């Protein structure tokens, strides 16, 4: 808690797409953005493009889940407000297990796919994504689903409750 401060945790398989990152950066008052994904971290071409389109005044970083736990374990970012970008709620539960503190998780968007169920206009969940959301809720963590801060906030459990019992 006396270390970095998670300004917001946005889940999105697209990471930065459109101005969702631009508007969310100014509204969230975020000057730093860290991407946690082993698949992207292994793509040097994609990392270059994301780093070259990093919003002005905002820095974009690319690290893996194991490396991310260590960056947070460094008080060098104490008080610093950083935004966490994830592609799947599974990676979020992993950070929590490492002793990372998360009060709430925001679902930005998830590419739909066959075998998955559509819960929102562009949010899909599989039996694995749902299982991770239930564990976060059981820990008292709030789960909100919303594409833009200007759109009505919905509860992840409510959307999954009307689908999965």
């Amino acid at each position: 808690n006396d270390y970095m401060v998670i300004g917001l945790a946005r889940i999105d398989d697209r990471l930065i797409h459109g101005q969702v990152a631009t508007r969310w950066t100014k509204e969230t008052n975020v000057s730093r953005i860290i991407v946690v994904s082993d698949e992207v971290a292994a793509d040097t071409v994609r990392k270059t493009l994301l780093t070259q389109v990093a919003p002005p005044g905002v820095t974009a970083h690319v690290v893996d889940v194991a490396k991310m736990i260590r960056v947070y374990n460094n008080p060098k970012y104490a008080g610093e407000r950083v935004m966490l970008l994830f592609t799947n709620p599974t990676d979020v539960e992993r950070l929590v297990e490492g002793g990372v503190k998360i009060t709430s998780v925001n679902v930005g968007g998830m590419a739909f796919r066959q075998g998955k169920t559509q819960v929102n206009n562009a949010v899909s969940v599989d039996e694995k994504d749902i299982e991770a959301f239930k564990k976060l809720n059981a820990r008292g963590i709030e789960l909100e689903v919303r594409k833009v801060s200007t759109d009505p906030k919905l509860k992840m459990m409510d959307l999954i409750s009307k689908i999965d019992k």
């Binding site: 040097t44 990392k47 270059t48 780093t51 070259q52 990093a54």
Partner: protein, 129 residues
């Protein structure tokens, strides 16, 4: 003179140097590295260090790289971090290389050379119209 190291994705650094030498004659105290798919920044840091071991870095080192944020840039950034007279300049082009190599012989100060490289690199981009 001030040392210059050129780094670009792929194998273009060696050719940018060759092009410069076609214009100016063979150059001394210049190194270069390549970056192949499969390599990471740590590989590149070693490559840069091996090149630096062969250069006279007493007056400083200027890393000229292809683009801001790529691996060549990221690795060079980690080397210059708390070093005096070490700088990384992205967007390397022939006008920048030629002007920088020419001025280097008149023994300019480090800040003077860095400023000239950025200015000539940018002024070198011009459309005929």
């Amino acid at each position: 003179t001030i040392a210059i190291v050129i780094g670009t994705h792929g194998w273009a650094a060696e050719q940018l140097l060759k092009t410069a030498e076609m214009l100016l004659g063979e150059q001394e105290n210049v190194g270069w590295i390549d970056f192949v798919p499969g390599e990471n920044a740590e590989t590149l840091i070693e490559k840069y260090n091996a090149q630096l071991a062969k250069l006279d870095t007493t007056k400083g080192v200027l890393f000229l790289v292809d683009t801001w944020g790529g691996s060549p840039f990221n690795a060079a950034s980690r080397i210059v971090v708390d070093k005096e007279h070490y700088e990384v300049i992205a967007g390397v082009n022939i006008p920048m290389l030629v002007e920088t190599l020419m001025a280097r012989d008149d023994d300019p100060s480090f800040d003077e050379l860095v400023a000239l490289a950025v200015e000539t690199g940018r002024e070198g981009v011009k459309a005929l119209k």
